[PDB]
C-alpha cells in the first residue's frame, strides 16, 4: 500500500507541476512502454478529446485498456474486447 | 541617452519572461494611461492580429499612433490622420 500511495503522490505532483507551467496536454509515459511510432504524439493531439490512450500491442491478450468493471473495479471481458 | 538603454532593457527582459513562461499575448500598459473600458482585453484578443494597439483619446490631436515616417523616423502628418 505504501507503493500505491507513493505512486499516487508522484503522479499528482507531476499533474500539479504541469498546471503551474501553463502547458497544454501531458503525456504520462513509463519505463517499459516502447512508443515506436514517431507520430504517436501528433496523432493523439489531432483527435480533440480530453483523455485518450493509444492501444499498445503485446504478446498475449493483454493491453492497456479495459472494457468493463464488475462491481468494485475489477476486469470483466465484454464481447467488444 | 542612458535612459533609452534602460527602458529598452526592462521591456526586452519582459518579452523574454513572457516567452519562458509559455504565455500567449502580452499587454504593455504604462502606468500613466487610463484603460477605461473593462472589456478592452477581450476586444483586442478577439481580433486575431499580431501587433494591435487601441486608439486612446487626448485633450489635443496627440494620440498613440503615427501614420507616416518621413525618412529618419520622425512624425509626418499625412492627410488620413
Short mmCIF file of C-alpha atoms in Angstrom, two decimals:
data_model
loop_
_atom_site.label_atom_id
_atom_site.label_comp_id
_atom_site.label_asym_id
_atom_site.label_seq_id
_atom_site.Cartn_x
_atom_site.Cartn_y
_atom_site.Cartn_z
CA UNK A 1 0.00 0.00 0.00
CA UNK A 2 2.94 2.35 0.58
CA UNK A 3 3.95 1.81 -3.05
CA UNK A 4 0.44 2.75 -4.19
CA UNK A 5 0.47 5.89 -2.06
CA UNK A 6 3.93 6.89 -3.30
CA UNK A 7 2.96 6.41 -6.96
CA UNK A 8 -0.26 8.36 -6.42
CA UNK A 9 1.63 11.23 -4.79
CA UNK A 10 4.25 11.30 -7.54
CA UNK A 11 1.67 11.40 -10.33
CA UNK A 12 -0.43 14.07 -8.61
CA UNK A 13 2.71 16.17 -8.10
CA UNK A 14 3.51 15.81 -11.80
CA UNK A 15 -0.03 16.89 -12.71
CA UNK A 16 0.18 19.91 -10.40
CA UNK A 17 3.60 20.88 -11.78
CA UNK A 18 2.22 20.65 -15.33
CA UNK A 19 -0.61 23.06 -14.46
CA UNK A 20 1.51 25.85 -12.93
CA UNK A 21 3.68 25.99 -16.06
CA UNK A 22 0.84 26.88 -18.49
CA UNK A 23 1.11 23.80 -20.68
CA UNK A 24 -1.43 22.11 -22.90
CA UNK A 25 -1.53 18.31 -22.78
CA UNK A 26 0.54 15.92 -20.66
CA UNK A 27 1.77 12.52 -21.82
CA UNK A 28 2.15 10.01 -18.99
CA UNK A 29 4.77 7.56 -20.22
CA UNK A 30 6.54 4.95 -18.12
CA UNK A 31 9.75 2.94 -18.27
CA UNK A 32 8.97 -0.15 -20.44
CA UNK A 33 6.43 1.28 -22.90
CA UNK A 34 8.10 1.29 -26.32
CA UNK A 35 6.49 4.22 -28.18
CA UNK A 36 7.73 3.05 -31.56
CA UNK A 37 5.71 5.19 -33.97
CA UNK A 38 7.21 8.71 -34.18
CA UNK A 39 3.80 10.28 -34.89
CA UNK A 40 2.07 8.88 -31.80
CA UNK A 41 2.06 12.28 -30.09
CA UNK A 42 0.81 14.20 -33.12
CA UNK A 43 -1.95 11.72 -33.96
CA UNK A 44 -3.14 11.73 -30.34
CA UNK A 45 -3.07 15.54 -30.28
CA UNK A 46 -5.07 15.76 -33.51
CA UNK A 47 -8.17 13.98 -32.16
CA UNK A 48 -9.61 16.63 -29.78
CA UNK A 49 -10.61 14.57 -26.74
CA UNK A 50 -9.80 15.06 -23.07
CA UNK A 51 -8.23 11.70 -22.16
CA UNK A 52 -7.09 9.40 -24.97
CA UNK A 53 -4.66 6.49 -24.95
CA UNK A 54 -3.09 4.53 -27.82
CA UNK A 55 -3.77 0.80 -27.95
CA UNK A 56 -0.35 -0.77 -27.39
CA UNK A 57 0.32 -4.27 -28.70
CA UNK A 58 1.58 -7.22 -26.65
CA UNK A 59 2.35 -10.92 -26.98
CA UNK A 60 -0.89 -12.02 -25.27
CA UNK A 61 -4.46 -10.81 -24.87
CA UNK A 62 -3.04 -8.17 -22.51
CA UNK A 63 -3.24 -4.49 -23.47
CA UNK A 64 -3.70 -1.13 -21.77
CA UNK A 65 -7.48 -0.71 -21.77
CA UNK A 66 -10.36 -2.45 -20.04
CA UNK A 67 -13.87 -3.00 -21.35
CA UNK A 68 -15.82 -3.43 -18.12
CA UNK A 69 -15.70 -3.07 -14.33
CA UNK A 70 -17.59 -5.67 -12.35
CA UNK A 71 -18.71 -4.01 -9.12
CA UNK A 72 -15.61 -2.86 -7.21
CA UNK A 73 -13.25 -2.11 -10.09
CA UNK A 74 -12.15 -5.48 -11.45
CA UNK A 75 -11.67 -6.60 -15.02
CA UNK A 76 -14.57 -8.18 -16.92
CA UNK A 77 -14.38 -9.25 -20.57
CA UNK A 78 -17.07 -7.56 -22.62
CA UNK A 79 -17.61 -9.19 -26.04
CA UNK A 80 -16.24 -5.95 -27.56
CA UNK A 81 -12.66 -6.74 -26.48
CA UNK B 1 20.69 58.69 -23.75
CA UNK B 2 21.34 56.40 -20.77
CA UNK B 3 17.58 56.25 -20.16
CA UNK B 4 16.71 54.83 -23.57
CA UNK B 5 19.18 52.00 -22.95
CA UNK B 6 17.43 51.31 -19.63
CA UNK B 7 13.81 51.48 -20.80
CA UNK B 8 14.75 49.09 -23.62
CA UNK B 9 16.45 46.70 -21.19
CA UNK B 10 13.38 46.46 -18.97
CA UNK B 11 10.96 45.72 -21.82
CA UNK B 12 13.24 43.20 -23.54
CA UNK B 13 13.57 41.48 -20.14
CA UNK B 14 9.76 41.21 -20.04
CA UNK B 15 9.24 39.92 -23.57
CA UNK B 16 11.88 37.38 -22.57
CA UNK B 17 9.96 36.37 -19.45
CA UNK B 18 6.66 36.24 -21.36
CA UNK B 19 8.26 33.58 -23.60
CA UNK B 20 9.96 31.46 -20.92
CA UNK B 21 6.62 31.07 -19.12
CA UNK B 22 4.62 29.67 -22.09
CA UNK B 23 2.11 32.51 -22.23
CA UNK B 24 0.02 33.74 -25.12
CA UNK B 25 -0.14 37.51 -25.61
CA UNK B 26 1.49 40.32 -23.64
CA UNK B 27 -0.06 43.67 -22.69
CA UNK B 28 2.35 46.62 -22.49
CA UNK B 29 0.49 49.17 -20.37
CA UNK B 30 2.47 52.00 -18.78
CA UNK B 31 1.11 53.33 -15.50
CA UNK B 32 0.04 56.69 -16.92
CA UNK B 33 -2.60 55.61 -19.43
CA UNK B 34 -6.22 55.24 -18.33
CA UNK B 35 -7.76 52.00 -19.62
CA UNK B 36 -11.43 52.80 -19.04
CA UNK B 37 -13.48 50.23 -20.96
CA UNK B 38 -13.31 47.00 -18.90
CA UNK B 39 -13.66 44.79 -22.00
CA UNK B 40 -10.63 46.14 -23.88
CA UNK B 41 -8.64 42.92 -23.43
CA UNK B 42 -11.42 40.82 -24.94
CA UNK B 43 -11.85 43.06 -28.00
CA UNK B 44 -8.08 43.22 -28.55
CA UNK B 45 -7.75 39.43 -28.21
CA UNK B 46 -10.69 38.56 -30.47
CA UNK B 47 -9.22 40.38 -33.48
CA UNK B 48 -6.52 37.85 -34.44
CA UNK B 49 -3.66 40.18 -35.37
CA UNK B 50 -0.01 40.10 -34.38
CA UNK B 51 0.60 43.62 -33.00
CA UNK B 52 -2.59 45.61 -32.36
CA UNK B 53 -2.91 48.78 -30.28
CA UNK B 54 -6.15 50.53 -29.28
CA UNK B 55 -6.61 54.20 -30.07
CA UNK B 56 -6.62 56.38 -26.95
CA UNK B 57 -8.17 59.84 -26.75
CA UNK B 58 -6.50 63.01 -25.52
CA UNK B 59 -7.25 66.69 -25.00
CA UNK B 60 -5.36 67.53 -28.21
CA UNK B 61 -4.61 65.91 -31.56
CA UNK B 62 -1.86 63.80 -29.98
CA UNK B 63 -2.70 60.09 -29.78
CA UNK B 64 -0.69 56.88 -29.52
CA UNK B 65 -0.09 56.10 -33.19
CA UNK B 66 1.80 57.77 -36.00
CA UNK B 67 0.66 57.49 -39.60
CA UNK B 68 3.81 58.19 -41.61
CA UNK B 69 7.57 58.07 -41.01
CA UNK B 70 9.48 60.52 -43.16
CA UNK B 71 12.95 59.08 -43.67
CA UNK B 72 14.63 59.19 -40.25
CA UNK B 73 11.73 58.11 -38.03
CA UNK B 74 10.09 61.47 -37.36
CA UNK B 75 6.36 62.13 -37.44
CA UNK B 76 4.69 63.24 -40.67
CA UNK B 77 1.08 64.44 -40.78
CA UNK B 78 -0.46 62.53 -43.65
CA UNK B 79 -3.97 63.69 -44.64
CA UNK B 80 -5.52 60.43 -43.38
CA UNK B 81 -4.71 61.13 -39.72
#
